[model samples]
Target chain A: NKDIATMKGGTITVSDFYDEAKLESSNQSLVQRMIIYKVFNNKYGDKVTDKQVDAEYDKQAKSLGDTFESQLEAAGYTKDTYKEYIRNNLAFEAGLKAHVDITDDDLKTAWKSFHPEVEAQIIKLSSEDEAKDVKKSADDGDDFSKLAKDKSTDTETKEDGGKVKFDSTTTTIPAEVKEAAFKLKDGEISDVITTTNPTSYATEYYVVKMVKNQNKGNDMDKYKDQLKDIATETKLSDNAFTTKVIGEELKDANVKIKDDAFENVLSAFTTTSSS
Target chain B: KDIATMKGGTITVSDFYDEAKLESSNQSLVQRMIIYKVFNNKYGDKVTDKQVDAEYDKQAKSLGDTFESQLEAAGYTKDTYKEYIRNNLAFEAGLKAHVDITDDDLKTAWKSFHPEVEAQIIKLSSEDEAKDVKKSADDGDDFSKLAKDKSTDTETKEDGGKVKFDSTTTTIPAEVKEAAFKLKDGEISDVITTTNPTSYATEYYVVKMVKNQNKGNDMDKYKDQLKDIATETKLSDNAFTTKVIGEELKDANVKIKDDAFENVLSAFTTT
Candidate 1:
């Protein structure tokens, strides 16, 4: 424990350093990847704090149907370190917004490849007969929202007068039907269509008409809203900008290993140029 | 090798290396033992003669129950594979030698990056047409007879249906070049095809390998010239890793002395 290697800053004991080195050797990269995030935290970090972390902690906990820190304990994920799990996330969030310019103008110009969102007025029905009923009522000069309020099975939207609007991903209207829905006139009505509303749900019938197609990058309102939600999107988060920067740096990164330290290398370790 | 001024703590890559090992635990356990042969044989820092034979027997059992079956699947004879293992050991020991990388080495690497294949091609007219040639090739009949009798490459048909050129000779179809790399030393391939966007342009092929050489001469000297460039980055002030290990109350905020580390790879080159 007394003497192994000595340096000017301070001396690390021979017996002590190897154990710590074994631990540090593995953790160095994790800690290394976090440096830029911490640098980014100075700028984007104003919004993130220990208190902010707590709220997210609870959010993460509650998502796991738990409370506080114990939410991660039973999951085997807790065996991992805290900073790699949390601080990098904080830095990553900060890094995403710190210097990279994803302005409203940028979002406006890149909405479709990035967003491709659209909204529609939907009228859900339990049967084809019910679909027939809504079509006639819509044709009868009745407002579609009021008709939805009186007859639709989707209570969430029915209560709001079929007020569902979206510019994203997938929908209850079959993809083919949704494509047809957008191609129609602004105030048009679609034929009765059947679709599985959710992966967990039974097939249901619906009639749809286009309300707004905000996929055009010019819609500042939709673009603004999607932008707020996009930065931390799993696609953009984790391994996006922060990862890109580190990945580039790692390309030319250097390391020096001492002779004795090589013994700590296990039989399973590989020496490929890249990890 | 400057041999001093390590920016990060002297690293033993088992941390990085260990984690990857755990991740790829599915790799062959017996084959894994072979990695050490490349370590320190020359300095008597490695295995001895009898020990080598003994290790081979143990690996033969581990690879399979017997010597020949296992060694054959691994693509070598017992005597041949033994040298392969010894050569790997020598390469590893060689890395310990001073390898001062130079700018010429880097330039050589970048130049070889786009090296291309050069081989002979026998383009057939169609799939059904190539099948007869495939039968003749399968039967070990003289390929020249098939090339002269069946090939549509009229210029080469007169010359035993062999087309020879280097990678820059793109005048030859790339599909032909693409197929050449897949052949064994004297392999006659199954019916293959090439195409173009011109009217009725589907070209089937029954190629025979005359030979191939890398497009560049005396290239890959950088294989023994590339050096490792491992970066040891700094940790942040506020980074807190609250992992509770045995009796050690660690604070991730401390200036992780030797916090960074990397090992330069020896003699491996890529641009």
Candidate 2:
């Protein structure tokens, strides 16, 4: 079981959930403690002169029951790995509890900032000539909407005179077109613009007409409980505390990466081709 | 007047006024015919002589002088300008002749190549919440109503999350096209992710019905002008002519290696 608080430097900042060194040390400690307790119990048994091994076994069986199997399974271990799992789980639980922190405020804040709103209109053109013509007409006192209806090559919005009510926040238009549209004043028309089609050799022209803009309001008072939860979890990310804690544990443990026949199995990641 | 005969395949036309031979002659008509031929080759079937004349008239009106002065200002002689217009008209006529447009063709094209798809969209607060909503949608909830009620994408939420597809004639981005094309009529998609992280992810449900498909008349209003294009295409494909040109170019002392060097040589050659 890896200590939850330990950090491994380089690109990967944290250790795996179960630290092997921590698990080994924990198992050793548990064995020592259990031996001491068993010795004390044996001394008590001797005073009663009950020389029956069956009685000791029965007493142990009564306390242990099927818990050992469950504990092993819970820690992702088989029969041979049971003691190791128990030891690792115990150490991991201690380490995680010591570092883990969450609050209601954290959850609420997360909820509050989660969603946003945006508003804009969309117009798409076919050729650069058409785009220029539309731009010239719009510049020459023709209504942008009317020209879009008369000459805009895009069939979907041509009838509507190129009025597209879109949530600019989540929806994506071409970067060039988007920049042009966002820069204009409300209801202002864009200059003639061209963008390459994603999959083809041709270019698509655009002349955007901005219409409306609004933002989603913030209110933490109405959702305090949710806010707290969001804020608490967010706080856990404060100052990289968890990373430092995990790093210290791993350093003290002196864990090593073994080199063996299995080392090459992991080494597959380093080379482009198979050995 | 000198005469020069020009052959286009089996058809031969003789020019009564050999403007090249008559160097002092005002050869605006001959120049205009050549320009018209080039335009005819490029534009194909979209323009006609009448349309060309209309365009010429528009240009002439804007120029405030004779078409010759306007052409000269643009580095072309009067005859060259007229030739350009004539060729453009011919190309337009050719395009109309070759490119067939049928009712069935238009219908099929509309179904597959329509620029935009009408869709209901749903935006969620986070990827996790989006997953949950997607599961629910998959379990058979009305997508548009759900979007209107719960979508964080506020822009399209009011009209049952409906948004129009904007352009049909131009090209669209591959990722967007892939996502849009994957949708069935009235079927919802899982959160279609975007490469841009600043913008929120969205999932859309399309409800598109092809409204109308226009297959315009084939008798291209510009037939006479398009003949030059067919002539050019036929001329370019002649194996004997191409072989002769290839041999000439190979034998020519052309040191074409680098792009910069090529440009330098081109400038020298032109001058």
Candidate 3:
């Protein structure tokens, strides 16, 4: 190896250059990343189709538009290498799925709170008594939408006759109001529901008139894909589960570093499994 | 040289170099190499060997029993690692030559500072196990005995699980240190569940508070400490380092002989 670089009063030998480069934390990180990608790719790479990588690449290219080539160059990727990068990511996701187990119970649990969006008109009031009065007027044949317009305290919805749409995942509407709304048949008026504002900690009252509900019914299979996604996300975010899966994979890898410089690159994963 | 041999293939020195070079942004690497060389050439004599040894001792003490393993893990033996320390000191001297620390910088560093926390800890593998130990300690079981019997932290288990850490300590996890700081003297913390930053492994800890001192209202009394902290801040601040490196490299007039590294100094090139 020759002196790879020189200055007026100093010269960098190959050993000096490489040793300094390798001492960088990112190089150590780069080695660890390479090892993980290798382990997962060897086991699960076959399962990832080239079409998936191609589709992802097309999506990225479309998003980046005219700068796609320049962006790739900036990231130090050629077209082929960029495709491989996409494929590696897709392969890692496959590896994540390989370690995940979605049981019947898991899907069933996910179904408990899931629902399609429902259409409803709500009259929100600061006082429970006023909400009851508004509820009585609506039940006594005053137009429900008109009552909502006249009595509702919720500014965003009140101007539009209190019309709003939400599902289980919607955060803007109170959960108590949604629960009551979900119980109603189409064009049915519900009892005044009480809830506390999450941010203000103030009590609130809601009178709901359901326009339509997307009945989930008893069957959970219809939303199987959605349910599986939710369950997978939950499992993936759990530190215990992810660590165990990655730890076992690295242990099974039986990785050996021929050079002392990188001997402990994967120790963060390997040593974790033993203890 | 073979850098690594794994199940998939062997990583040769050339292969690793080529791969690592792509992963690197040459500007920063070359800038640092220049900093080490030029700074040491100009100001290395000012840094005494004893001062370097003191810095090394402070770092090793901070890591405790894990110092040697930590060194090896980062791919350095003691001698090679010391060279890094020496280079670091040289850079520090170089910084002192260029940058002046104002009283405002000291006050800025003082705002978020605390004196060190001395505590005894018991690290366990499971929350349930940590709860049991914490319960017994709360019920008057000796904390030191509990640590000796059940703690999995190899560093402090033998020394009655005792450890001291300032805010900058890397050996103690931030969660453990933060939790330790919250306790009153002689108070025992609840089971704190945290993940290892590197390994992503779950860790459970129970800390018995020993001493956590507050930086009192007077800033002048801690002038030297605050100055040191401010200097550290400048060393880590990229804006400061880049400015310093730019000036030094311009003065050093470094030449890139190898084509492989010609572009590395391109960012600092006068023309």
Candidate 4:
């Protein structure tokens, strides 16, 4: 529907259309990079404006040796389309800037785990009863070394008293137990953590005993710098930060993409291969 | 100009529109000011003049020679822009009194959003080619053979031209969901061609296996939840935010000084 809106019987805003821009190819790192850079440009500094946007865009465009039309063309962005992008971004930041802290600690905390390497014992049981049985034996001061070797189904460690230290680099099992394992304190048993749907919330519970606990000197170190970069990107990438902003501003104002417009401004946000 | 003239304070039309895009009214400043004044009066902050003027100069110079012109273009007068700065600082001071994004709020909103879709498509490059493709499929011919013979789209040509996605997906053309919705599940579609002037994409498709819009475990399903939030919310406008402010101002005790509306709104006037 080309109708933008019907407000007080007078409607039409950009939402009437999906704001689809015709692009030559989907790989517009040119546009994405500009948006992300401007995001930071506006964020840690003064509020953004059309002048900086123009001056900045023109300054960068000077290097390409193309007319503004071609630059917009290659980028698959219409002039109007680009303006909306900046407007929403500035408003979003204005909203977010009105609230919350954007810190490295806040950044890393928002991002829960990252291939967190830990040493933990897992009892794979067919039933929750069996899981409880394993839990009881551990709680009853039974020798885990003897008990695990006898009953553990983590075949790699079943014979070795269920002592398992996952490799620092294992995408193979990072997601399922990564958060839970890293969260547990040393020498604590998790309460029936499920491994059933490795990637989803499902059944198949495992009684995990935190063996040595995860320390900081592993693959985490290798990805430490990357995590900061990614964490910042991840925080900026979602509407949670901006929506939190909009949600706040709306408290005073009442507000929407609806906030998808805010989120859409982050379209070029992911640091992964410009995808 | 009588944005809000309640008791001790007076907000003008210029304070709202700021000589920028005048018709595109910005109630934010005054709405913010009225709210700020409400709070500022209740809680006094009669401090900082140098800082305010200096930050104003900083923003004014942040752009170039035509900085004031730039400010107006972006929707702010010197005062309105100053008001923006004022509100930001004031709102920040009152931050704890306002925004908190709890996992409590995000869980239901995020979980409520599931973006996914699945489809099997056979695409032809032109209308002439599409006609032949549709004719063969109508002849009760095997789609596998027709697709292999005429489908110019490489990824799906061999595998019977299947496209699976969610609202998060973009690999397929933007028009597909809008087109495929005309057919029921597993129903074949006649030729759909995207030939709009604005759209440079010139592809013809004969669609099948239409799961027009759906959900699943595919990462293609990871669009921002805002689209569904907007669509489900039945909003066709961006003025929803402004409307809320307007509604409040409508409900508030507001008045304007005479001649204030003309003096300021005229600042944004065309010759």
The model with the greatest TM-score is 3
Per-model TM against the reference: 0.36, 0.21, 0.51, 0.23
Model 3, runs deviating above 4 Å: A1-5, A9-17, A21-25, A60-82, A116-213, A221-229, A268-275, B12-29, B41-75, B89-244, B255-271
lDDT of 4 by residue, B1-271 (tens): 2322222333332332222212212222222334444333322253245656777887665567898897645544687677556654443343323333344444434554434545677877678888887787787787777777778878788877767765335466656656665566767788887753335768888877556544444423443554344333323233432343343333433333322122222221222
What digit string (tens of lDDT, one per residue) describes model 3 on residues B237-256? 76777677778877877776
Order the numbered candidates by TM-score, best leading. 3, 1, 4, 2
Worst 10 residues of 2 chain B by lDDT: B4-13
- Full candidate order by DockQ, most accurate first: 3, 1, 4, 2
lDDT of 1 by residue, B57-135 (tens): 7666545466687555444567766755555444333343323446564554445232333333466766776787788
**lDDT accuracy of residue A57 in candidate 4:** 58
Candidate 1 chain A: worst-modelled 10 consecutive residues by lDDT: A261-270
**lDDT digits (tens) for residues B83-103 of candidate 2:** 556665564454334444344
Q: Provide the TM-score of chain A alone for each candidate, in the order shown.
A: 0.49, 0.36, 0.59, 0.37
Error of 2 at A130 (Å): 1.7
What's model 3's TM-score?
0.51
- Model 1 residue B11 CA deviation in Å: 11
Write one digit per residue (lDDT tens) for candidate 2, span A1-275: 11112111211111221111112233223322332222223223233322233354345446667885565444334554443323433443344335555555455556654432224444567777777776777778877667777777778678886766543233335666665665666767778778876444668888877676444356645545545544554554565654454444433433232312112221211324448
Q: What is the DockQ of each candidate?
A: 0.03, 0.00, 0.30, 0.01
Candidate 1 structure lDDT = 0.50
Q: Which whole-number lDDT from 0 to 100 does residue A265 have in model 4?
A: 31
Share of reference contacts found in each model: 0.04, 0.00, 0.61, 0.00
